[PDB]
Structure 1
Amino acid sequence: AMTRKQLINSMDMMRSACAPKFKVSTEMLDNLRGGIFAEDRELKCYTMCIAQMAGTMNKKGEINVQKTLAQMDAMLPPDMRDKAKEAIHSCRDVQGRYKDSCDKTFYSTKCLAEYDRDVFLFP
């Protein structure tokens, strides 16, 4: 799996690909990585772009939870891995409450952060 430094480098590259498509500032993006979620549609759709870049958005506009779990297994350092997977399982039905795909990814991500803020990270 990646080290935490490598994981951050990977997340930074995903941010650098997706952030230009949305009216999202460093304050908004750093806050999001830190588990603070501005209620801003541009930030919600940024989270969907990140899920799309990870290849975890199906073409129906839903989150592929099994693919997300397989990525965390492969990529996350062990102090993060089992906790991230338990968070993902816990939050797997949040997306069913939202019609809009940017809502699905934003609120699913916020569920992961609330599950354990010390483990949580996001691009």
Structure 2
Amino acid sequence: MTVEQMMKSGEMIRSVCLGKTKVAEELVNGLRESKFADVKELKCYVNCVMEMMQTMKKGKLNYDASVKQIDTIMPDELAGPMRAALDICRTVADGIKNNCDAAYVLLQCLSKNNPKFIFP
């Protein structure tokens, strides 16, 4: 995928998701700094992004789509550590019934376990 198209989609996804949840941008930017504030609309922003990316459905991790996406967006140097994160975190959100909470728990884990973590 082209940097052009990849940036475009990540922007698209951010646009859609900021639109649906009306979260403050600073909060969303906070995420890339591991500031995981317990804010309902920030949690649902995260869930929105994961649903858009096909990585989560009905608050459940669907694994192969995530690896595809990791490997497509990231170069090898980064995907290595990130697929690892997804493996370490594969069952971390099981039994979380609320979709937004489940997504947020997964993001926390991915960020804790991946030094090259990026998020739309």
* TM-score (norm. length: structure 1): 0.85
Counterpart in 1 of 2:41? 42
The unaligned stretches of length 5 or more in structure 2 are none
Q: Percent identity?
A: 34
Distance 2:10 2:33 in 1: 13
Distance 2:93 2:99 in 1: 8
Q: After the TM superposition, which segments of 4 or more aligned residues of structure 1 sit over 2 Å from their partners?
A: 5-13
1:51-66 equivalent positions in 2, closer than 5 A: 51-58=50-57, 60-66=58-64
Structure 1 residue 44: Cα displacement: 0.7
- Contact 2:59 2:103 (C-alpha < 8 Å) held by counterparts: no
Structure 1 residue 39: Cα displacement: 0.7
* TM-score (norm. length: structure 2): 0.87
Any idea what SS the aligned residue of 1:95 has?
coil
Alignment RMSD (CA, Å)? 2.0
- Contact 2:110 2:117 (C-alpha < 8 Å) held by counterparts: yes
Identify if the C-alpha distance between structure 1 residues 61 and 107 changes in structure 2 by more than 3 Å, giving closer, same or farther. closer
Counterpart in 2 of 1:92? 90
Count of residues paired in the alignment: 120
2:22 equivalent to 1:23 = yes
Q: Which has the higher contact order (CA 8 A, sep 6+)?
A: 1
